């Protein structure tokens, strides 16, 4: 019926309802200041319910996340942006804003040590340094990796040498015996000794840490604490940047930071006025994050608002596993479909099914149940065109994305010389 | 008017939907009852359990709070897995118990306090060391329980039922010392004689090093959940914790919930007993070893379990698909609060659960879902479909946010 | 029932509602025709914006993938585009190879001298290219070994470089010939010094790494030496085109080497300097024939800026599935916005179904009114397509069309192979 | 309709078209000499796109392959025939023809050593001797088996003793240490030493070679080369025969020969006039061939034409794996369905689906999409009746197979 691609109908019975772009825009418009999603103002209550932007590469995920960041800043919200090539940084970065990039002159000095405040914070952040294993077996090695990491990094802290270079030496360079000796006195003293199984466990933990820690070590150090930054209202915005050719090298470090924010907001003091955004341009690009799940379910009070991008259902599935991936996607109440490749009929089907069906009375009438949006309609979407379906009881609408231009108020990258 | 689909001439068979009010009159009984989203719960549906499935922020709290409240007004006892002490601060009385290693008001506890017979050693070893996520992980877990039960059994024998002693032995003492200490116990030989035997020991250590931590640092006392259950005048138990420590306390919290699950099976036959078990988020605990039997053999002890879920993939990931199905299946009453449109599989599951009906229209026999997956995806907050156990129709009802005054501080730093 | 004749193979319809729309060949050709110079796909001018969105050409053997890729290469050359061609039996080389063009074939007299050492420029480039030399393992277990093999490879080759002997022969000797102890000793001082020692597990891991490197390195070693760098070649505008050739009977022997070169390009374009004028094509005649490339996915997602345009061929969905795994293969195919279906065997109903579904359905209104949802192209229509006939469905909002492939003839301006 | 078993229709819209036996025979008939498939002349361009004949046992797979072979010989094509019990050899074998059977008086002397011409040929044919493992794990062992085989066999050749008996001794009889010693100087010197894993690997390689090599050793010695035979125009035809009760024992050797042909044709010199047939009576009966895939895809210019038989989709699936078996079946552009058991509904469905559906317009007007051939129609096919669907755009046809009689121009077997 105009805003509905299929045959017009006489009466809408139940299910997903689709409305015109403008019609939606008036429906979601509210008294208070709001952020916009592809020109449509986002319902204030849908913000802490999170947003998922699914779409093939080049369809407008950037234009959209850029606009969402912009309107959020104009309202004065704070935010963390996993920002590739410092694009968002060059457009919205102010002078009081933070930068995390081991190769950027302007980056702050950091070590996970800087986040430890209580004893339970050791495993908490070991979980962030060493993300979840892709497979059950890889997770088993990871757990030994965390054991070795936490007990070793704990002792180094005790003995006044919370050195990352030291922790790395111990965990991956020192001989098996030396390490064993250093571990004496720690909960790990006996756990990694006594059988071939125990030695194997230690070897596995070594390999893990040798894989995860490199970047953390070469990370410029300082006293910066993501925890303290979150608690500081006058703290700026955090931009996690990196050059694309190094994406794979920094995957474990960047996932570390993203996870740190995820656990940390759970510890921030009860503050109703806080509004923190978490921008993860490509969710399936980070490692299987340990705390993301809880952050997406218990971050309302902290005022957490997560926006994530995805392309094919198989990407997240491969990283988190099918079961765990479904749960992850399910935690984003608000969805945006940007149209994908016709070569990916499975995700187009998944997106079509998510947008949902409606039961209509068409034209002796007739009741018909049909997809509001056909997989084919998603496959044939032109660029900068999106279907916006906000959390809760709202109708969805096909809306165009407009490319607004933003001036570069800072260099995206600054060589670490 | 209440069936979202096209009106029909005649209902033939299947799931029947009725108006909120119509149902409230149908389910209302003479005796005192508790309410579910404003609907009086059939007295016989209480021990058949209730499952509340819904996306985050849909009203799972408002509903569980309501149930708890109406259950208290009726004088029913209850154990509440209460995050951030929300429930505690609203309904906690002075005679009520608090379990939180980090709250000044907590009772002192150790699983030792629940041992009364010999068979209680494995029974609660299963509570301390929950079921493994995988078949391999469970193999380790069982080694961990052997190590646990035999070491903790000797420590009790020699008059030193110390959790710090148990922890030292099982994860700190060297292999040989431990081996020595185990001599004379059923585990004397089992963990010796081959590389395999030493491997099983190594696996049991790791498990116990993962599970025991919080049990050790837990404040000491002679509090017994078993005894608490047998005491009529005992208050209500509030298991609380600060969210940023949820992961850390996951094994401990699961321990307590499980303990309740096995223990109620040993309570003396008491027809007058009405005990509620509130697990805000079922998939958030570990794979509980005794929950299954509790949901099947707790009628006689008066057990009433209420649990919340979000995505079917959550429970599935923790219990495994086969086991998770059996678990969800044990809850006779269901409440659907509406989920994300990004989770079509669960919405489909809930739609299917609500069921289909065969209807006759303007004739035409039609089979259709009473509630479409889409209708559940588009439900507004504080709106739920209530489908009680047995032969009852379902109804879409609105949840009302009743306000409760804080009659106690949610947390009290120790 | 007007619409649906000479375009849609099904019953003609009264009104098109939604979904995939099919148009005639000619009608598509004017629709996609643009002002700027364009390349052609089966005679159909390709949308300039569809180029960096990549193209996937699926079809049974002998249906015309060659005629198509050859045509694409040709028109791309006429426009002055640069390109890297995975060229079996030097066919493309013999038709389009010029004198300034590069050749990579360890057994061709004209090949350039290469070693992955030639691509190392920063420290992060060691693991980066260890990923290229040692592709992803087919199974989770095989990948575990692969990682050990990359650890051994990167630390050993790193030291050899430090000590001024960046030798492939030396690297090969150390990693697969020297005894466990000697290697262990050479490794002292490097990150792997302790990692490969201390338990049976550690020694097992070293043994696994040795096996992998003994499997991948062979051809790298026998590869004629030189200072040629694929990275530097990419940065050089006047650099010609790169033809990676090989004789078919050696395909399996060079599979690991060739996969390394293709991956080298896939990571390297990510480091090229921002140049809006760059147009680089990557022709991989048969994607499932190379190994599970480590950098492909990111290149198909982050190469627009570098001007990367990938063109790949496939036959049965099970081929790429077996190499990359089902999930990872889905993601990969999904990264190609444009599709060309050439028709498969009737003995492969699963793939014909996959292609039919990818081509999509349409919802139409026909007479007797009835709304009908149906596949624009049936699996049977694809199974029954004659040779040199294809369905072209460009990226974005464009209709698809059935077009005939014309066999243009190209004179041999160079011998396909030279030497032994 | 007299061709289509379902309800006649007013108009054909799209999909698979079915035509009468005769109608198809006129359609496919060509000017050039052709071979026939169940009486139907096979399109010349469909020959190098291969032919797959699916059918239950006793439906006529033999009558058909026999017919194909005969008409192929009448045209003068050369061929390799995996020939059970020497049936094909006894009807078409001439005197210049080759026979490979370790237990037949008339066999040629062979060793894989006879196929080595360049260095890359060692692994190439170690792949032929040691076929692909049924499981990922079994293949891991097989890869160690090939490492052990190629390095050992290579040295033995280097030192002037290319003995199959020497190779077998070294790889499965010599003690671990001696072997290790012998391997010194070869690429495998260190690879199989240094840890328990290294020793485990060696042990795996021994087991594998001990399973595969047996028949290779006991195989009569000679200087015959399948490679050279292929390059020789005047070379006859190759009949790979064996008595059925020994099928399991010879499975690894016969699979080796088939694979050698599969890789070797990739090295033959460019010859547009060559027409070489590869008859594999039952594809799932050989091992997971390492080079079949590439042969079914890159053998056009060598003139390879492959004809294979199958019964149930589960057979090939179990040997090659579901993914790899689909890829394999998909590489045969032409298909023949002979009718299967009603106890194998899945394969009948796979064949029905492969045959395809059509969208038709019938008078009640109704557009209907339906299987041209129902699973049930294939389950109920009488013997010697088949559906012939050539590669490309041709209709399919239900045709009868005629049992032509061929005189025995040679004994099937000759005890040695
Ligand atoms: N002509 C033009 N189009 C632009 C420009 N910037 C953005 N666009 C439009 O926006 C689209 C890309 O959207 P975007 O959200 O950046 O895509 P992405 O997948 O996030 N990133 P990328 O484009 O790098 O792959 C293009 O298809 C184009 O239509 C520009 O400078 N010129
Ligand atoms: N089925 C149907 N027929 C109707 C309706 N209203 C009027 N009719 C009358 O019935 C005729 C069609 O009946 P119908 O049962 O659909 O015919 P059919 O196509 O043979 N049956 P089917 O669709 O089950 O295959 C129309 O020509 C019309 O005159 C209605 O709502 N449903
Ligand atoms: N105005 C108001 N609404 C409330 C209050 N508590 C809950 N609600 C309503 O109920 C919804 C959340 O329900 P609730 O049961 O707390 O959700 P939950 O998932 O169990 N926990 P949470 O709300 O912390 O995310 C909110 O979206 C809001 O509409 C309150 O104190 N005031
Ligand atoms: N006359 C002729 N036809 C050709 C030529 N190249 C390809 N063809 C035609 O196109 C078909 C094969 O197409 P092609 O794209 O080469 O197929 P491919 O699968 O990529 N490779 P191949 O042809 O080697 O099997 C042949 O059957 C033939 O009809 C040529 O040089 N001359
Ligand atoms: N009268 C007759 N019928 C034959 C002869 N050879 C085959 N047939 C017919 O064809 C059927 C077997 O066909 P065939 O192609 O040999 O089957 P196969 O499965 O390849 N081998 P087999 O028959 O050994 O099981 C027999 O059941 C019979 O009806 C023959 O010499 N005489």
B198 contacts on A by Cβ (under 8 Å)? 194-197
Q: Do A15 and B171 touch (CB under 8 A)?
A: no
The helix (H) or strand (E) run that includes residue D304 is strand D304-310
Same domain, A326 and A283: yes
Same domain? For A145 and A182 the reply is yes
Report whether B334 contacts B50 (CB < 8 A): yes
Do residue D103 and residue D128 come from a single domain?
no
Place of tokens 């209460």: B82
Candidates B289, B406, B341, B392; CA nearest to B24 is B392
Give the pair of three-digit tokens for residue D150: 């190629």
**Any idea what DSSP says for residue C48?**
G
C-alpha C64/C-alpha D169 separation (Å) is 50
What secondary structure does DSSP assign to D91-112, as a single string?
A: HH--SS-EEE-TTBTTPPP--G
Instruction: Count CA within 13 A, CB hemisphere, residue B226.
Output: 19
Structure letter (DSSP) for residue B17: B
D244 and D319 belong to one structural domain: yes
Question: Could you tell me which of D402, D404, D401 has the C-alpha nearest to residue D338?
Answer: D401
φ/ψ of residue B94, rounded to 5: -80, -30
Looking at the complex, does the CB of residue A135 fall below 8 Å from at least one CB of chain C? yes
Cα A291 to Cα D227: distance, rounded to the nearest angstrom: 62
CA-to-CA distance for C157 and C165, rounded, in angstroms? 9
Nearest residue to A239 (alpha-carbon basis) of A411, A87, A80: A80
Residues C269 and C335 in one domain: yes
**CA B60 – CA B310 distance, rounded (Å):** 10
Closest alpha carbon to D214 in D246, D261, D178: D246
* DSSP labels, B261-272: HHHTTTS---TT
Query: What gap in Å lies between CA B262 and CA B248, rounded to an integer?
Result: 23
Reported as half-sphere exposure (CB side, CA atoms, 13 A), residue A397 has a value of 22
β D334-337/D51-54 pair status: parallel
The two three-digit tokens of residue A88, written as one number: 């968002």
In a 3-state reduction of DSSP, which class is residue A91?
Answer: helix
Tokens encoding C266: 């896939």
SS3 for B121? helix
Q: How far is the CA of A375 from the centre of ligand 2 (A)?
A: 30
For residue C63, give the nearest of C283, C252, C281, C314 by alpha carbon.
Answer: C314
What span, in angstroms and rounded, lies between the C-alpha atoms of C270 and A243?
9
Q: In terms of domains, do C333 and C272 share one?
A: yes
- The CA distance from C127 to C123, in Å, is 8
* A344 backbone dihedrals φ, ψ, rounded to 5°: -120, 55
DSSP string, B186-224: THHHHT-SSHHHHHHHHHHHHHHHHHSHHHHSSPP----
Locate tokens 């006892």: which residue?
Answer: B77
Same domain assignment for residues D19 and D145: no
State the Cα–Cα distance between residues C243 and C88, nearest whole angstrom: 9
Suggest the residue from A330, A350, A388 to mutate for an interface test with chain B (most B CBs closer than 10 A): A330
Q: Is the CB of D11 under 6 A from ligand 4?
A: no
Residue (of D5, D27, D24) closest to D352 by Cα position: D5
Residues of chain D by 3-state class (helix, strand, coil), percent to 5: 45, 15, 40
- Closest chain D C-alpha to C40 CA, distance in angstroms: 25
User: Do chains A and D meet with 3 or more Cβ pairs nearer than 8 Å?
Assistant: no
Q: What is the C-alpha to C-alpha distance for residues D155 and C137, in angstroms, rounded to an integer?
A: 30
Question: From CA A396, how far away is CA A352, in angstroms rounded?
Answer: 12
H/E segment holding residue C19: strand C15-19
What count of other Cβ atoms lies within 10 Å of the Cβ of residue C170?
18
Residues B309 and B351 both lie in one domain: yes
| Cβ–Cβ under 8 Å, residues A221 and C218 | no
Question: From CA C243, how far away is CA D239, in angstroms rounded?
Answer: 42
Interface probe for C, chosen from A343, A371, A382 (most Cβ of C below 10 Å), is A343
A367 bridge partner residues: A361
Length of chain B: 414
Domain that holds residue C153: 114-226
Judge contact between A335 and A55, C-beta under 8 A: no
Q: In this structure, are C239 and C197 located in the same domain?
A: no
User: Is the CB of C61 within 6 Å of ligand 4?
Assistant: yes
The span from the CA of B384 to the CA of B334, in Å, is 10
From A326's Cα to the closest Cα of chain C, the distance in A is 14
Q: Quick one: tokens of B210?
A: 């993962």
Looking only at the bridges linking them, the beta strands covering D357-362 and D334-337 are unpaired
Specify whether the CB–CB gap between B236 and B275 falls below 8 A. Answer: no
* Cβ contact C338:C55 at 8 Å: yes
Verify whether ligand 3 is closer than 6 Å to residue B281 (CB atom).
no
Query: Hey, which residues 73-132 in chain C have their CB within 8 Å of chain D?
Result: none
Relative to the alpha carbon of C91, which ligand is closest?
4
Using DSSP bridges, classify how beta strands C370-375 and C22-23 pair: parallel, antiparallel or unpaired.
unpaired
Solving technique: X-ray
Distant-in-sequence, close-in-space partners of D307: CB < 8 Å, separation ≥ 6: D50, D51, D52, D53, D65, D68, D277, D278, D279, D280
- Residue appearing with tokens 């223990």: B263
Cβ-contact C94, C413 below 8 angstroms: yes
Per DSSP bridges, beta strands A9-15 and A357-362 are antiparallel
Please, are residues A13 and A361 in contact by the beta-carbon 8 Å criterion?
Answer: yes
Which numbered ligand comes closest to the C-alpha of B363? 2
Q: Look at residues C396, C405, C406, C404 and name the one whose alpha carbon lies nearest to residue C21.
A: C396
* 8 Å CB contact between B78 and B92: no
Q: Out of A222, A238, A269, pick the residue that ends a domain.
A: A222
Tokens found for residue B3: 């069936």
* A160: its two tokens: 């006044």
Quote the distance between the C-alpha of residue B332 and its chain's center. 15
Look at chain B and report how many structural domains it folds into.
Answer: 2
B122 contact partners, CB below 8 Å, separation of at least 6: B145, B149
Please check whether residue D126 is in contact with residue D152, taking contact to mean a CB–CB distance below 8 angstroms.
no
- With 0-12 / 13-18 / 19 or more C-beta atoms within 10 angstroms meaning exposed / middle / buried, residue D131 is buried
Specify burial of residue C134 (Cβ count, 10 A radius: 0-12, 13-18, 19+): buried
Give the domain-ending residue among D222, D252, D282. Answer: D222
Residue A307 near residue A69, CB atoms below 8 Å: no
Nearest 10 degrees: CA dihedral of B167, B172, B178, B182? 10
Q: Taking Cα atoms as reference points, which of C338, C277, C342 lies closest to residue C315?
A: C342
Token pair 């509004």: residue:
A275
Q: Helix A196-212 to helix A247-264 angle, to the nearest 10 degrees?
A: 100
Q: Is residue A139 within 8 angstroms of chain B, CB to CB?
A: no
| Contact between C214 and D187 (Cβ < 8 Å) | yes
C63: closest chain D residue by CA: D392
Judge whether B304 and B277 are in contact, CB under 8 Å: yes
Contact between A228 and A117 under an 8 Å Cβ cutoff? The reply is no
- What's the number of CA atoms in the CB half-sphere (13 Å) around residue B269? 0
Same domain, A323 and A384: yes
Q: Of C211, C93, C225, which Cα lies nearest the Cα of C145?
A: C211
CA-wise closest residue to C208 among A145, D131, D194: D194
Q: Which alpha helices (H) appear in A93-243, and where do they start and end?
A: 121-129, 136-158, 164-168, 176-183, 188-191, 196-212, 214-217, 226-231
Query: Which residues, including other chains, have CB under 8 Å from residue D160's CB and lie 6 or more apart?
Result: none
Task: Determine the longest span between alpha carbons in chain D, in angstroms.
Answer: 83
Q: What count of other Cβ atoms lies within 10 Å of the Cβ of residue A391?
A: 25
- Between β-strands D276-280 and D78-84, what pairing exists: parallel, antiparallel or unpaired? parallel
Round to whole Å and give the CA distance between D54 and D50. Answer: 13
Rg (CA), chain B: 24
For CA atoms B276, B279, B282, B288, the dihedral sign is negative
Report the distance separating Cα C260 and Cα D62, nearest Å: 47
Question: Which residues, other chains included, contact B143 with Cβ-Cβ below 8 Å and sequence gap of 6+?
Answer: B191, B200, B201, B203, B204, B207
CATH of the domain at A386: 3.40.50.300
* D298 contacts in chain C (CB < 8 Å): 248
Whether A16 sits inside 8 A of B247 (CB atoms) is no
Q: Do C290 and C84 form a contact (C-beta atoms < 8 A)?
A: no
Look-up: residue for tokens 């360049």? Answer: D118
Mutate to test the pocket of ligand 1, among A55, A58, A83, A310 (most ligand atoms within 8 A of CB): A58
Residue where one domain finishes, among candidates A222, A245, A271: A222
The neighbour count for residue B72, using CB atoms within 10 Å, is 17
Nearest to D248 by CA among D216, D287, D209, D207: D287
Asked whether D297 and D325 are in contact (CB, 8 A), the reply is no
Count Cβ atoms below 10 Å from residue A181 Cβ, excluding itself.
12
Here the tokens at position B172 are 């700190």
Give D-chain residues touching C250 at CB under 8 angstroms: 120
List chain D residues with CB under 8 Å of C208.
197
Mark whether A366 and A258 lie in a shared domain: yes
- What are the φ and ψ backbone dihedral angles of C173, each rounded to 5 degrees? -60, -50
Return the CATH number at B116: 1.10.8.80
Residue D319 CA from chain centroid, whole number: 13
Pocket of ligand 1 (CB under 6 A): A 57-58, 60-63, 383-384, 403; C 304
Sequence-separated (6 or more) residues with CB below 8 Å from residue C409: none
Breaks (C-N over 2.5 A) in chain B follow: 362
- For C154, residues 6+ apart whose C-beta sits below 8 A from its C-beta are C126, C127, C130
Q: Chains contacting B with at least 3 CB pairs below 8 Å? A: A
Name the nearest CA neighbour of D88 among D76, D108, D72, D103: D72
Distance from CA of D222 to the nearest CA of C (A): 25
Buried b (16+ CB within 10 A) or exposed e, A69-105: bbbbbeeebbbbbbbbbbbbbbbbbeeebbbbbbbbe
Q: Could you tell me if B53 and B140 lie in one domain? A: no
* Minimum CA–CA partner of A168 in chain C: C191
Question: D40 pairs with which residues across the strands?
Answer: D37
DSSP codes of every residue in A314-376: HHHHHHH-HHHHHHHHHT--EEEE----TT-HHHHHHHHHHH-EEEEEE----EEEEESS-HH
Q: What does each C-alpha distance from A393 to A17, A45, A369, B381 come to in angstroms?
A: 9, 12, 19, 8
**What is the torsion angle, in degrees rounded to the nearest 10, for the CA atoms of residue A221, residue A223, residue A224 and residue A225?**
120
Closest ligand 4 atom, residue D45 Cα: 27
Residue D86 has which token pair?
């020497």
Give the rounded distance of the alpha carbon of C22 from its chain centre.
28
Spatial distance between the Cα atoms of A30 and A33, rounded to a whole number of angstroms: 7
**What is d(CA D209, CA D179) in angstroms, rounded to the nearest whole number?**
14
Query: How far, rounded to the nearest angstrom, does the alpha carbon of residue A402 sit from its chain's CA centroid?
Result: 24
Phi, then psi, of D153 in degrees rounded to 5: -60, -30
Residue pair C283/C300 in contact (Cβ under 8 Å)? The answer is: no
């Amino acid at each position: 019926q105009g805003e509905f691609g299929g045959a017009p109908f006489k009466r809408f019975l139940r299910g997903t309802r689709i409305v015109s772009g403008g019609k939606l825009k008036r429906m979601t418009r509210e008294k208070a200041k709001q952020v916009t999603v592809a020109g449509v103002p986002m319902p204030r209550d849908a913000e802490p319910r999170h947003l998922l932007v699914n779409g093939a590469t080049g369809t407008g995920k950037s234009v959209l996340l850029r606009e969402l960041a912009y309107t959020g800043l104009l309202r004065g919200d704070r935010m963390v942006i996993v920002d590739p090539n410092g694009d968002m940084l060059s457009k919205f970065g102010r002078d009081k804003d933070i930068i995390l990039n081991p190769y950027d002159q302007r980056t702050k000095g950091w070590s996970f040590f800087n986040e430890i405040r209580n004893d339970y914070d050791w495993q908490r952040y070991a979980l962030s340094v060493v993300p979840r294993g892709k497979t059950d077996e890889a997770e088993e090695w990871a757990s030994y990796g965390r054991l070795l990491l936490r007990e070793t990094a704990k002792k180094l802290a005790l003995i006044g040498t919370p050195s990352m270079r030291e922790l790395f030496h111990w965990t991956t360079i020192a001989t098996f015996d030396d390490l064993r000796g250093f571990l004496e006195g720690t909960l790990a003293e006996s756990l990694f000794a006594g059988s071939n199984e125990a030695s194997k466990a230690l070897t596995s933990a070594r390999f893990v840490l040798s894989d995860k820690l490199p970047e953390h070590v070469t990370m410029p150090d300082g006293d910066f604490s993501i925890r303290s930054w979150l608690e500081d209202p006058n703290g700026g915005n955090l931009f996690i940047t990196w050059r694309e050719d190094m994406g794979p090298a920094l995957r474990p470090l960047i996932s570390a930071w993203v996870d740190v924010v995820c656990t940390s907001i759970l510890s921030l003091p009860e503050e109703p006025k806080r509004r923190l955004w978490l921008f993860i341009d490509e969710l399936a690009s980070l490692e299987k994050l340990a705390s993301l799940a809880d952050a997406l379910t218990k971050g309302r009070k902290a005022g957490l608002r997560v926006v994530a991008g995805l392309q094919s259902t198989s990407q997240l599935d491969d990283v988190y596993g099918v079961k765990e991936a479904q749960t992850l996607r399910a935690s984003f109440r608000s969805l945006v479909v940007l149209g994908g490749s016709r070569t990916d009929p499975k995700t187009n089907e998944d997106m079509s099914l998510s947008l949902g069906e409606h039961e209509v009375e068409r034209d002796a009438l007739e009741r018909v149940r049909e997809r509001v949006v056909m997989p084919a309609e998603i496959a044939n979407l032109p660029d900068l065109t999106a279907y916006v379906g906000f959390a809760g009881n709202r109708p969805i609408a096909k809306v165009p994305l407009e490319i607004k231009q933003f001036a570069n108020r800072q260099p995206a990258f600054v060589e670490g010389t």
